[PDB]
Amino acid sequence: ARGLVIGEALIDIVAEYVGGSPLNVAVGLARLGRDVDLLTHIGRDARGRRIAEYIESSGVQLVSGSQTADRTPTATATYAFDLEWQIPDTPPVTPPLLVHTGSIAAAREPGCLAVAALLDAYRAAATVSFDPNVRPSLSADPDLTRERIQRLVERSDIIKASAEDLHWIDPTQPPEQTARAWLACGPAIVALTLGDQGAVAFCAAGPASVPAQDTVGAGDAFMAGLLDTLWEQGLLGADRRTELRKIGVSALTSALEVAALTSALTVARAGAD
Amino acid sequence: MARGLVIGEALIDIVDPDPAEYVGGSPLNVAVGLARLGRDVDLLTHIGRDARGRRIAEYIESSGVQLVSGSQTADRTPTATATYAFDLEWQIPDTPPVTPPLLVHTGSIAAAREPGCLAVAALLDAYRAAATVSFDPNVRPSLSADPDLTRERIQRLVERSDIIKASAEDLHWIDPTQPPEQTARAWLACGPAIVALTLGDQGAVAFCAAGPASVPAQPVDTVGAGDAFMAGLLDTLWEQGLLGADRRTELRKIGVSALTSALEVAALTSALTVARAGAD
Amino acid sequence: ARGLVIGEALIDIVDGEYVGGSPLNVAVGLARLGRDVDLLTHIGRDARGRRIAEYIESSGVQLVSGSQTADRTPTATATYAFDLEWQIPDTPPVTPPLLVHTGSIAAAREPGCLAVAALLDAYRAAATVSFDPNVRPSLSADPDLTRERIQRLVERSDIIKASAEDLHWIDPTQPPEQTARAWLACGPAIVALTLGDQGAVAFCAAGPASVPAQPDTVGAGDAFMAGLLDTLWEQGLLGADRRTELRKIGVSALTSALEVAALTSALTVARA
Amino acid sequence: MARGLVIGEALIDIVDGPDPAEYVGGSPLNVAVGLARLGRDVDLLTHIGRDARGRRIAEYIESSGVQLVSGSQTADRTPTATARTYAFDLEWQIPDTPPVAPPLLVHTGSIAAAREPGCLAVAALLDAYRAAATVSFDPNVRPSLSADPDLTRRRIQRLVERSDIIKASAEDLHWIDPTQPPEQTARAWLACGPAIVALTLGDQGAVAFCAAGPASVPAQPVVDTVGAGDAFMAGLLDTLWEQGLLGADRRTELRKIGVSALTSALEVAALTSALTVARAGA
Amino acid sequence: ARGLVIGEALIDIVDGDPAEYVGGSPLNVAVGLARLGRDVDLLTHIGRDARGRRIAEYIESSGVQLVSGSQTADRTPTATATYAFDLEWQIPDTPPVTPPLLVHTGSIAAAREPGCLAVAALLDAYRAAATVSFDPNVRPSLSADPDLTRERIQRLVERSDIIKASAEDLHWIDPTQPPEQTARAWLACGPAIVALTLGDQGAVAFCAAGPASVPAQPVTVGAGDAFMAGLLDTLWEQGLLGADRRTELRKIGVSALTSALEVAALTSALTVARAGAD
Amino acid sequence: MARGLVIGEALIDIVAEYVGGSPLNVAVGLARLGRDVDLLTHIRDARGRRIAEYIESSGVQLVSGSQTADRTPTATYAFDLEWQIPDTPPVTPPLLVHTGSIAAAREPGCLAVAALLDAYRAAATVSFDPNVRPSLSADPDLTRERIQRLVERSDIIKASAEDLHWIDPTQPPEQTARAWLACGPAIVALTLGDQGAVAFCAAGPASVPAQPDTVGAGDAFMAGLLDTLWEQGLLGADRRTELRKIGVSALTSALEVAALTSALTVARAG
């Protein structure tokens, strides 16, 4: 029962904090009590040391080859990015129960090709989950990254996205339209957060929703709570792919509720301080 | 007094806690719901001459619904067991002994299950010179029947209906690639006067030529509540004087305001049916 | 730095007399919020026209010359029946406005609607163009002509506001948000859509915005429009000089303008 | 004494254009006529009118040696299919229980297998006859789709499960599943209960599958493809009849047919079809 | 009504005092279409050296109009005999011609930086007016990240109306599946037609209406490009090119597609036969 | 120096009795093509000395411990046969070990066969021909399992469309073959009756058309395939990577030689 997360860890400079949407998911799952491996790309500099200690002090096992970057990637607040995404293409862990990726790691060369490869590798053993987490302020080529997202959708079992992500993906369509088009491409579950309007999700059995419950990391905490409940329902792992697709509306609604409340609790505990 | 006709399944729900058996079938609930609101209603169904069949008949009679002659020819009264397995035959006489009704309602299993569904389609055609036609697809989650044939059959009933009510779940099953409101608006364009769409704890919406209508959600079974919504909707359009073939043009011209009131009455009838049963 | 409103002004006649007209209400709403506004219309030289003229001057709106030529002042009678003509000079006597707004009957009714469409193209060089279809089909016309004219105004507009009822009548086969997003992709920077007690939504390149509800039917719709134009004005996004900054409006800025518009409309209702 | 029963449409094919013409047609009718011409005794249950076209059809049926089943002539008017653009004027209905002794073989396919209301009665007749009869089926979707462009695949798949012998074209199976080569679909059909699934590949010959393995036959050097496919079907059924594999009594032997016996059935079917075409040349 | 071909023009140098020939797979398709009577523009990347003057003369002789901005290369590209490339592929991303009826690309122009980014842009700029056709014609010997190459092929597959590939192309794209399966899967991404040549076994093609096949022809370099020109030329003649006919192209019947395959196979075989003559 | 090793059954075919057994035919085929070959089998009576004489008159050498069979197994198909081999043969490391048919599937001997192939692969190319004969009653599920394990340890595999149909009737035989190629083998060859043969390797597929007949033809195809890969210099463990890298041109030549060897065997018979 191990999870594998592949994606960027970085430093958010406003003062500086440890960030990266794939890192937040990894640390979110571990805080919830799961065994998580994190393949990433940080430095051996002061930042990459603070990142590695933040990872270590969270229970997330840092996969070897993750500290090979020249400089530790940074996001300086509308965001300015100085980052390189590249990871060893060799499968570094015993095949996990779950492989999760998204954000910059899924769409940025040269790591994005290895990630899609690695995803293709572990897919026969692991459930694939993905969060596009569109950060347009990072470089560009909108068509390439729009196309790479669409190809990861086609490879994925579980998808979570925000209405803002899907509006970037296709402004001509309501985000529910886009999410339903994504479900038709293969996934068992497409979850859609709607900010002040709550969250909805779609599976073959039907739509689910949770009502209205904007700070950094709320989306990744939602994703972690989603994967953790699906894990707890016994639907992760390729062994359980066929019943992931068959999840009932009541189960999905309850996974959605837990993910929405997990995200809200992470916000409220961060607002207390 | 003008009469309503409901055509559709009556069955026993066998709930496998403390095993119990309940009278059910969505068209039966609609017939019973219309009768309890004070309407005269006939039900054409397919049950057996057996223990369960005689109970359905007694429960039908108790609430004021008249059973149409020829409804009792099944070898065994249909049942549904909750892993939600069905033991159901659906068949009806091609030419039932019924004088022209003001309203004919069908839906659910009766609308899509062979061989009775063919006669259901034909009877809607024959009755619509006198009767308003209403339709509730109410896809039964088991819905063991072939998906594509079911979609085709539902679509042919849409084209023959004046009033349609469906849930968001219904329409997602009909077409998972579109939001339910898209499907409902495509249904309205095929001839109905009104397509109503229930949205769970988000209330209900409805569409007519004049425009959209909306009702916010209220504060036990979802399909039982759905059938009381349907009976409330038809009873209130009945009261507004819009039922009957002779009123079909006025029904198609219903105002957004009249439609909104029909929707409020429907949503309150349904919530009140739940609240009263929940207090036992 | 003035705004120009082009549209009908009429008297609303109840079943069994009030100063009306969707464009006139937007002009008065803008005048009431402190903006200098010119209104070009078609009110007759008769008792009804004088009341409209006094109402306009009291509000602070300046009537445009050549707008008082109507053969008979147009009238709206409640259902609604219209005794109305709509005619405007090919070329109004006004310096280039910062903003030109039209809609409703003026956009669709001949012959005046033909000048409107040309004036909007000519004004875009100086003016933000705003449009509110505010469908009134009780004044009959070829329905596909009406739809064709509306679509061409959409293509020449920077700001559109419409009701779910309007877009239902425009295309009953689509949900109104689909129509609104299709309109947005035809040039406009902002399409705002009111949904009744479900609030309002608006779309721009940056993303969607929304405000919830409960915070006169078209009376309140026109005041929503005035409040929307006034806040965008105050945000410094009006004028051809600011068109690219309008098209880049942020979801936060658009949410703010939606809120001010919703509150402006509610406050107009509540005060009267 | 043993008799075959064919259930399916007889119709008039109208060619509207250069030298317009009216032909007797209907793929199940062709199969019945083809079996009678090969010497078999055959009843045809169908749905034609007592109008001018209906009498032409009935005369063509009797001249071929096919016996028209009673109840076959209650149509308000004889079905037609017009190629102007394809237009059908066709009703398909049959009595629930026809006046026929238990046949050795019951064949259906094409429009009659898929068109309401008659297709319901067809599917129940197959279930009732299989205790005495081998069941054969030819989906022949091209005319079906021309008639019902929204036709659904489930109608066909229900008949697959009821059948002992299936013949289809690559074009048929591509429509059933365009994502897979037609041989994939044929092998999936085989695993649902048939003893034999034969697949014609046009100018590449034909293949077939049974439990014992695959068989194949090369293309003929030499079009009325529907017509040629029906003679192929008639020749396949006639030669399995000859080999003593028809009848419920022979069903286990039919499932056990050897690759060699299946290959010979296919050659005879292929040659029967080619010979039927060549004799139409003159 | 003009076609526009976008792709590499190079010189093939034989293994050996080795001879040189004007080549490049998209070049060959443009020349092929011209020789069949169509008006064709070719956007390419050649030098003003002597090898580039030879290509230009060949283009000129063949009836093909060379597209402005095609002579910018620092050197004319070369392939030498497996093959070894001294090749740069860079082209203006600005639409250089009035929207054509057909835009065709493939081979190295499709998958090689930087010009492949421009190819995708020009295809996107012209698709509302032009049919898009594409032949992957993989040349793996040209050193490149194999997964980046696969990605860029896929993004052209999603843009295309007409695809032709060899069994060997699709094997290199996906070794695990029969080429017929990769072709059916490509047909699912948007194309109207995915044609597949199978060497000594003939050719097959797939559309929404069904598969088509043509037998093996009784009869090496550039036969595939001649097949592509013959396929596009017949579809041209059948009236299915141009975005205004895109709906009709997807509706192509098996019989029409079969005719197109036959003409394509005969055009390929005739181009080989005339080469063995000379 | 380099010797081939065949492990499999040797049989009598009762029509009229003829020497049979598919591995014996491959071994005999290789000897008749000029290769040096040892045959390890299970065979001490008038039929054994019949087979043993056939084995030595064709040039094959029997491996000591072969003629331990109580009765030489029989095929009349009705199979009267037992299959047992020593866990470790007295054999120096071969360049090539070939097994198949009953020997790969029948207890007890089949359990040694699978480990023997794991031991020999440090020196030898491993080849396998399933040559399915279900008339020999056995739990098909384990039989299917034993065949799959052998596929995992094989470098060269040849099967008929009939073989792969019995393995998985629900797949086109080219699909089963291309899936077999994915578990290790460098080459999977598939004969298609009168449609010729196909073979799959990493560099791409090969094909040969049909040829204008016993299942000795299949065996003689296998002997021709092995013999021509031997000649191309691709057998032995130290050539295994060049075998995996066989080109389509070279694979096509091997298919052709194998098809023609098989054709020539049947023609030179009648």
Nearest-angstrom CA–CA distance, A131 and A129: 7
The CA distance from D249 to D131, in Å, is 9
E145–A113 CB contact, under 8 Å:
yes
Contacts of E177 in chain F (CB under 8 A): 178
Per-residue tokens: A261: 């409340």
Identify the experimental approach.
X-ray
Alpha-carbon distance F266 to F270, whole Å? Answer: 7
The pair of structure tokens assigned to A18 is 């440890």
**First-to-last CA distance in chain A?**
34
Contact flag A174-B173 (C-beta cutoff 8 Å): no
Q: Nearest-CA neighbor of D279 among D69, D34, D53, D115?
A: D34
CB E212, CB E257: distance < 8 Å: yes
Identify the three-state secondary structure at position C121: helix
Token match 């011609």: residue?
E97
Do D152 and D119 meet the contact criterion of CB atoms below 8 Å apart? no
Task: Measure CB to CB from residue A117 to each of E124, E147, E154 and give the nearest one.
Answer: E147
Which H, E and C letters describe E53-97, residue by residue? HHHHHHHHHHCCEECCCCCCECCCCEEECCCEEECCCCCCCCCCC
What is the rounded distance in angstroms from the CA atom of residue A226 to the CA atom of residue C123?
A: 53
Exposure class string for D2-14: b at 16+ Cβ within 10 A, else e: ebbbbbbbbbbbb
Whole-angstrom distance, CA of residue D1 vs CA of residue F248: 59
Q: Catalogue the E-assigned strands of chain C.
A: 3-6, 10-13, 18-20, 37-40, 62-63, 75-77, 81-83, 99-103, 128-132, 159-163, 190-194, 200-204, 207-211
Q: Find the Cα–Cα–Cα–Cα dihedral B246, B252, B257, B258, rounded to 10°.
A: 30
CA separation for the pair C162, C156 (Å, rounded): 16
Resolution to one decimal, Å: 2.2
Closest chain A C-alpha to E111 CA, distance in angstroms: 14
Q: Give the closest residue to C197 by CA, choosing from B264, B19, A46, B271.
A: B264
- For D181, which of E180, E185, E215 is closest by C-beta distance? E180
Encoded tokens for B120: 């259901």
Query: Can you tell me the distance from the alpha carbon of D247 to that of D105, in angstroms, rounded to the nearest whole number?
Result: 6
Q: Do F171 and D190 touch (CB under 8 A)?
A: no
Rounded-to-integer distance, Cα C125 and Cα F209, Å: 74
The position carrying tokens 């067991």 is B81
Tokens at A9, concatenated: 């860890």
Query: In chain C, which residues have their Cβ closer than 8 Å to the Cβ of A168?
Result: 207
DSSP secondary structure letter of residue B58: H
The C-alpha angle F217, F221, F227, rounded to 5 degrees, equals: 140
List all residues 6 or more positions away from F91 whose beta carbon is below 8 Å from its beta carbon: F5, F38, F40, F63
Residue B105 CA, chain-centre distance (Å), reads 6
- Is-contact C251 C204, C-beta < 8 A? yes
Q: Taking an 8 Å Cβ-Cβ cutoff, which residues of chain B contact chain D?
A: 114-115, 118, 146-149, 152
> Which helix (H) or strand (E) element contains residue D11?
strand D11-15
* C128-132 and C99-103 strand pairing: parallel
Half-sphere exposure of D227 (CA within 13 A, CB side): 13
Task: Label residue C150 exposed, middle or buried (CB < 10 Å: 0-12, 13-18, 19+).
Answer: buried
Please report which helix (H) or strand (E) contains residue F79, including its range.
strand F79-80
- Whether the ω angle into residue B147 lies within 30 degrees of 0, i.e. cis, is no
Tokens of B275: 């609240």
Crossing angle between the packed helical segments C218-234 and C251-271, to the nearest 10 degrees: 140
Chain-chain contact of C175 with B188 (C-beta, under 8 angstroms):
no
Contact C185 A196 (CB under 8 A): no
Tokens found for residue D72: 């076959």
Give the number of other CB atoms < 10 A from CB of residue B50: 14
Of the candidates F176, F169, F186, F163, the residue with the CA atom closest to the CA atom of residue F236: F186
Closest B-chain CA to A178: B177
Q: Which residue of C has its CA nearest to A136?
A: C206
Helices B147-159, B116-127: crossing angle, 10 deg rounding:
10
Closest partner residue to A181 (CB to CB) among B168, B169, B177 is: B177
Q: For residue B168, give how far its alpha carbon lies from the nearest alpha carbon of chain A (Å).
A: 8
Joined together, the tokens standing for residue D228 give 């040629």
- The shortest CB-CB distance from C207 to any of A167, A172, A196 is to A167
How many other β-carbons are positioned within 10 Å of the β-carbon of residue B201? Answer: 9
Contact state of F204 with E171 under an 8 Å Cβ cutoff:
yes
**Residues of B with Cβ-Cβ distance to A207 under 8 angstroms:** 168-169, 172
Which residues fall within 8 angstroms of residue C172, CB to CB, at 6 or more apart?
A: B185, B188, B189, B207, B209
CA angle A75, A79, A81 (to 5 degrees): 40
Contact (CB, 8 A) for B42 and B68: yes
Between CA B132 and CA B103 the distance in angstroms is 5
Which tokens hold the place of A16? 């500086």
Residue F76 DSSP SS3: coil
Of E145, E147, E155, which has the smallest distance from its Cβ to A147's Cβ? E155
d(CA D130, CA D120): 16
| Chain C residues within 8 Å of chain A (Cβ atoms) | 175, 177-178, 181-182, 184-185, 203, 205, 207-208, 210, 251
Among chain F residues, the shortest Cα distance to E177 is held by F178
CB atoms F170 and D191 under 8 Å: yes
For B139, the token pair is 């896809």
Alpha helices in B16-103, H assignment, sequence order = 26-36, 51-62
Residue E214's beta-bridge partner residues? E203
Peptide linkage before B219 cis (omega within 30 of 0): no
Contacts of B185 in chain C (CB under 8 A): 172-175
Cβ-Cβ contacts under 8 Å for E143 (sequence gap 6 or more): none
| C-alpha pair distances (Å), F222 with each of B32, C213, F200 | 78, 81, 15
Cα–Cα distance for residue pair F117/F150, rounded to 1 Å: 8
Cβ burial, residue E276 (10 Å; 0-12/13-18/19+):
exposed
Beta sheet of A80-82, edge-to-edge order: A16-19, A10-13, A74-76, A80-82
Q: How far apart are CA E168 and CA F263, in angstroms?
A: 28
Nearest residue, CB atoms, F170 vs list D187, D213, D259: D187
- Which residues share a beta bridge with A80? A76
Report the candidate in E207, E222, E110 with the shortest Cα–Cα distance to residue E166: E222
